Design a protein around this ligand. Structure first.
Ligand SMILES: *[C@@H]1O[C@H](CO)[C@@H](O)[C@H](O)[C@H]1NC(C)=O
Ligand SMILES: *[C@@H]1O[C@H](CO)[C@@H](O)[C@H](O)[C@H]1NC(C)=O
Ligand SMILES: *[C@@H]1O[C@H](CO)[C@@H](O)[C@H](O)[C@H]1NC(C)=O
Ligand SMILES: *[C@@H]1O[C@H](CO)[C@@H](O)[C@H](O)[C@H]1NC(C)=O
Ligand SMILES: *[C@@H]1O[C@H](CO)[C@@H](O)[C@H](O)[C@H]1NC(C)=O
Ligand SMILES: [Ba+2]
Ligand SMILES: [Ba+2]
Ligand SMILES: [Ba+2]
Ligand SMILES: [Ba+2]
Ligand SMILES: [Zn+2]
Ligand SMILES: [Zn+2]
Ligand SMILES: [Zn+2]
Ligand SMILES: [Zn+2]
Lengths: 431, 441, 444, 442
């Protein structure tokens, strides 16, 4: 029943780690304690310089072996307890009680909230790497949950913790449960409680605001490194960690009509789809304002017919327009002379049969506009397939990407025209 | 098969790695080959789908075990051959030649240049972590070297490569030899040449420009992460990677009075020393032009007397001045009414705590020269806040080299220093003591 | 099951500890390993400087806390395995199998021999601190023993090993089992074998020779530090670690008639008793050949009457002689002129107290026989100077006419007739049947 | 409840006043905790009161005791410990809590009160340098705030501070305690309180004192050797040595891979070894000057001379160059080619294993040495046909240079000479040993 206390979540500029360590040492003078950090914390932690208390520095160093930054090599015991800063040991035998709870139960992780201002609460959590998304919500089976929000001591076996790909990546409260929920592991929120530090850290408003800003930066760098572009919550709140109007798009130049994310066995990053939807809405608005006849085309019409949205692995939007109405829209006659950046940041280009509207100068997610003209009662272009004009007389309202778009009438027939029978019900899933 | 080809230095957007892997397989279909990358290379490498060729993705991922990001997981042979993009295997029996050479020699690394436009050259290298410096130079004992500049296949034992802390940190050409040289290991540049790829990568000026921009960015991040603040060639062609006029100073606020670098078992970043020398020179220039009597004080006078420079673990400069001369200098007169940024960015302030003056390098970089006003009563120099000393030490002042210029010092400064610090202090430096610091705090 | 490997038995000048530690690291790269030494070994051990392999220096040091020299603070695991130099991990998971047997069995220690030229064997062991003796013999209930002889990996719980007073005193093979056997613990000798080092230490006869010497010196210092004077084996072989003719006696000058070892709740060291018996045997042989009438006196007679030997907490021997006979013995004649060293190294001298003689084992070892001269006044034996003990009294001469044989200290000695009445006259009724310390007003 | 445990460690079993000491403290408070600590059971018996608050702590391994029994903290349940020397007696009541009150209100982690004996404690300064194996004592400039005490004092400090040291009760406590506390930068405050002397003071006769001092001196010498204190000095003088000498082996023995054992221990060269090196250098130089052998400081010896006029503190030998053509002028050198020569003052002169150089050892047992490297002009260059080769004008002429306490000869413009051999800026950038580096590079 030997447990190593492992401290990872603290701020060098303001912490209660010395009190934390001394509290556990008072219950057992030989208590193994590992404080982990990326670089040597300054001001000095001034931990007891005793063999059972050790500081593990996790970044590479010119004068250290590979083993010196691998944390399992500091942990000899069967069980490990992640303790956040602000916790202290008061009553004895709490770690042993958590161990017997873990062995008695069926959850590979047990947790005991710390009585801070934000004690841990259960949460549900669903990770979809394919969609670059993590969704949180209220946990139906509490005290059994997928993740925790707030402060808690977490206990698990060392073999379980250190076989994870990133066991001590910060913030631990986000990184750990992303990895354990993806593996189908559960955490049991026990009824035990650890007391708070008698002199808690981040006592002033400046200190707390400084810590929250650097914590938000670490959380953003973590999610970007691990492929989470979107955190969403039950209730609707969204947290974005991908591209936007002032950045480049997430994947860059496609070759051979296969974007990079497909080889990573993922679909389109949700931030990229968001920009495409917003550009589709903007362009349609501009076109309808100028009185230009447009209709959904290609995979955009297909996605609209299938589920009213962009096909989740597509990376552009295709609209058809009447060649005759091109002149009615200022952005487009300007696009003939050269690239036009309008007042809202969108970039209209002609390149090439067609026009292309990019989300911004830096973010090259685009809507392609393909002009057709009626010559035979058939709609046709001039460089390269054609379709009869009666599919556009009239056009029908069709939900797409958050707004009501225009589609050819009888568009399921139109889609079997362009793609073959059964296209809507048989999606061509990437493999 | 005893060697595993490992490819780490290449660019996703333009490379010849397929030709590389193919060239080694054309000589032995069973040859073990590992292409290592942080993320899946795009466009697809389309490497042969055989068991002995593996793509090693070294970044941690939510869906993978810890072992997947450890490069030793992918190598099961005794040696590793680090092959740069642009190389190719043509003459059979070349890796076995490098094995025989390394076995018979005393160097732990052997290398063969590749016949590109930039073939490997032999270099000397010493790494001082205390001084945060990588000193390069021409290799006196060539073809036994400390580092290589250029393209080469480097062969060493897998157990050696993967015991390094950062075995595949990029650029490998920089990261590997910083680690091996610090360990006292040599690389032996053999009389063997690998051919270049028949379609070499980065052939256009544009491709090269993008590769070089990314490569320099990776080098800069690598040196900062590893605590190399200064790179030099033959003591010149200095390359800096630390603080400057526009940044914070490297160590920030001292709580000790023991700056952070002492707990890291190093000395003052050269980076910071340079700013201190710059500021001391500028302040002395200002004091002399304004007619302010100054002299080197405390550890600055001690360092000047010892070796004519700042003590390499100190972090400021101290000067004494006559108090009655303060009025002669506009920055100092302005410093008593509040903080003044002068025309060259230096910040002159009057620390109300100690009744002294402080001149910062810049508004953001708080390396400073301190000015201690003394005034004579009864022929003793004294001040009213806190050692006092007889004025005859200042009558007259003598020249003394310090920090790249000639400074003023008290006469009989060795006596002066001995009365302030004790006898023999010039000869017995209080060298930093990590063990003791670990004990006292 | 987590097991820390702990290495204590090795020589700095010649060892295979690097091979040992690497052999366990090849089975588990994070295997916790503690090498313990008294001082920093030179030449350098050059262990892997990785966090799971640590060097524990048990010396005091000005710049270290108390914890730095307490080995338990280096061991965080439930179990610890003492591994000797010259051993090697080859099979996977032997430590796990040893843990399993310890859990399943009743012994607090389990052991696996090492395939050296001298694998561990199973031994019985009784420790008697009161008698300063460790008695070894063949194991009656093997493979369950009190002690081992030879090289073995010994696995036990850290809480058990580090609760011992001297868990890592060298030689561990002697020190550990002296402590565990005294506590009634057993060591189970398992049917598992660790391999020997591929390049074993002490490869040359010279290197071996200096190693056997410094081990012998360490063992001797260990037994003296722990108060083991005598070690015996099943064949009857004895090794001594105390008194001899060439040294000082073990205990020094006695105040209050109560020697220092009694307050340590120990009896007379077995080496001091041996010297006392060989001195008694010699002195009696000299007096008989010289024609001096002697009889067992005081506590020596009492011990003879009880069990034919020196009282086990006594520290001298007392004999009475007719004073008219002193002139018959050359040593006694010389002793009145001064201290005499005789043909066998014994020292004869007239004492510095009450007109009696004293015979020392040697010049350096002052264990002695005291000779008390008596003369008959009127059928009553008496002296002119008397020490202030209840045992120093006049007595009737008829007790000496005639003397009777009585076994004492391995030989037949002369005793007063009716020695029971003689002893009760000098000590009070029932003295033979009621043993007590020389002075129970201080210690009983 | 009492907050101080009296601890008695400094006493002699054959002659002490410990029973009086214990009784005096129990007479102010019968429940006062008192601990007498000893390595073995003191004989003759102490016969201390058989009450629970009086305990004999035996600090010896024993076959029939648990680990806790030999640990002194086992016996202390109070926050504070008062180390009381034998010869003290408690008379004025409440002296211990005045000392507790002083300690809490002050800023020294130790407070002390002298005992009114023949040798009352006096305040001292103490600098401990493990790197130089030296304890430097002197008068205390900021008394009554000290680093160490000399004499008899009751010393009070927190139990957790005392029992956290490596050797809290090592004898003599008056030496071991302040070596450890001064190294930690702790201070002792000599309070203006005084304890009374025992009514019947111990060691009252000259013979008893002689025995007591002999054993104490023996304990002190063993303590400084075990703790690595080779030299004790008072005001920089009155040197007291505890290392090697002319009749012993050198401290670090045989060197493996030019890395002497002291470097791995994160220290520099022992001061006894440096002293012998300076003696041998001065002697060899004097012999060479009297015999007419031209010599010059070479290598690291010259480097130390130019830098600070002494052996570099982590070097362990001295190197001199000589003209080969002058070897015949020296008797000891002439004999050195034949075989090893012990000269009239015990120094040993040898021609080397190979590499053609001469070696002069301090003595037959102590192998600290000066090396002599013979050169000869071949053109204008100095060479040994088996050290760097350098132009001969650096020797035309030689210059005086302070070194190791005398004046030695050096190559002219030794600064240029040194950078030709070692590299630019060598005099100015010394790099003391790097044990962490050493740990990485064997
Ligand atoms: C994760 O998956 C389940 C179905 O397997 C789903 O019902 C649940 O809502 C998902 N998690 C969240 C937080 O929505
Ligand atoms: C991963 O788990 C396996 C099996 O429990 C174990 O052998 C290994 O040591 C673990 N990895 C660690 C703890 O880094
Ligand atoms: C790993 O590197 C360290 C250097 O710090 C060394 O102590 C250790 O022996 C190395 N292990 C191997 C197998 O090279
Ligand atoms: C140990 O003591 C037991 C119990 O009296 C006894 O039977 C046995 O013979 C003794 N063994 C030895 C080796 O003395
Ligand atoms: C102790 O060191 C201080 C500071 O280095 C010095 O001023 C003082 O003279 C030293 N004292 C002794 C006795 O060496
Ligand atoms: Ba499409
Ligand atoms: Ba200073
Ligand atoms: Ba008797
Ligand atoms: Ba040298
Ligand atoms: Zn995106
Ligand atoms: Zn800097
Ligand atoms: Zn004896
Ligand atoms: Zn020495």
């Amino acid at each position: 029943p030997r447990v190593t206390v492992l401290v990872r979540e603290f701020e060098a500029f303001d912490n209660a780690v010395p009190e934390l360590v001394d509290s556990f040492l008072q219950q057992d003078p030989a208590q193994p304690v590992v404080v982990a950090a990326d670089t040597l914390p300054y001001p000095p932690l001034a931990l007891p310089r005793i063999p059972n208390v050790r500081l593990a520095l996790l970044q590479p160093a010119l004068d250290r072996p590979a083993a010196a930054s691998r944390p399992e090599t500091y942990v000899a015991t069967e069980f490990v307890a992640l303790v956040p800063d602000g916790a202290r040991a008061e009553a004895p035998g709490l770690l042993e009680r958590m161990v017997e709870a873990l062995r008695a139960g069926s959850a590979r992780l047990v947790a005991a909230p710390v009585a801070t201002a934000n004690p841990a609460r259960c949460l549900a959590l669903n990770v979809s790497l394919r969609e670059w998304t993590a969704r949180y919500g209220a946990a139906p089976a509490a005290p059994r949950c997928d993740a925790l929000d707030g402060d808690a001591v977490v206990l698990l076996r060392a073999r379980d913790l250190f076989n994870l790909s990133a066991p001590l990546a910060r913030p631990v409260g986000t990184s750990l449960f992303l990895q354990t929920a993806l593996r189908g592991w559960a955490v049991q929120l026990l009824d035990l409680t650890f007391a708070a530090a008698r002199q808690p850290p981040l006592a002033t408003a400046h200190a707390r605001w400084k810590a929250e800003r650097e914590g938000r930066a670490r959380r953003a760098a973590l999610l970007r490194a691990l492929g989470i572009r979107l955190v969403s919550w039950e209730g609707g709140r969204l947290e974005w960690f991908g591209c936007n109007k002032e950045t480049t798009r997430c994947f860059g130049t496609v070759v051979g009509d296969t974007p990079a994310y497909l080889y990573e066995e993922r679909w389109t990053p949700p931030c990229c789809l968001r920009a495409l939807r917003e550009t589709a809405r903007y362009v349609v608005g501009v076109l309808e304002a100028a009185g230009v006849r447009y209709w959904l085309e290609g995979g955009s019409l297909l996605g609209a017919a299938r589920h009213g949205d962009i096909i989740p692995w597509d990376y552009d939007v295709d609209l058809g327009i009447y060649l005759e109405d091109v002149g009615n829209c200022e952005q487009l006659r300007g696009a003939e002379a050269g690239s036009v950046v309008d007042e809202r940041g969108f970039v209209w280009e002609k390149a090439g049969d067609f026009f292309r509207v990019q989300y911004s100068e830096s973010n090259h997610l685009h809507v392609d506009l393909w002009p057709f003209y009626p010559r035979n009662g058939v709609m046709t272009k001039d460089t390269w397939v054609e379709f009869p004009e009666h599919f556009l007389q009239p056009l029908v309202p069709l939900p797409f990407a958050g707004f009501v778009a225009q589609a050819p009438n009888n568009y399921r027939r139109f889609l079997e025209l362009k793609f073959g029978p059964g296209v809507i019900e048989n999606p061509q899933y990437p493999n």
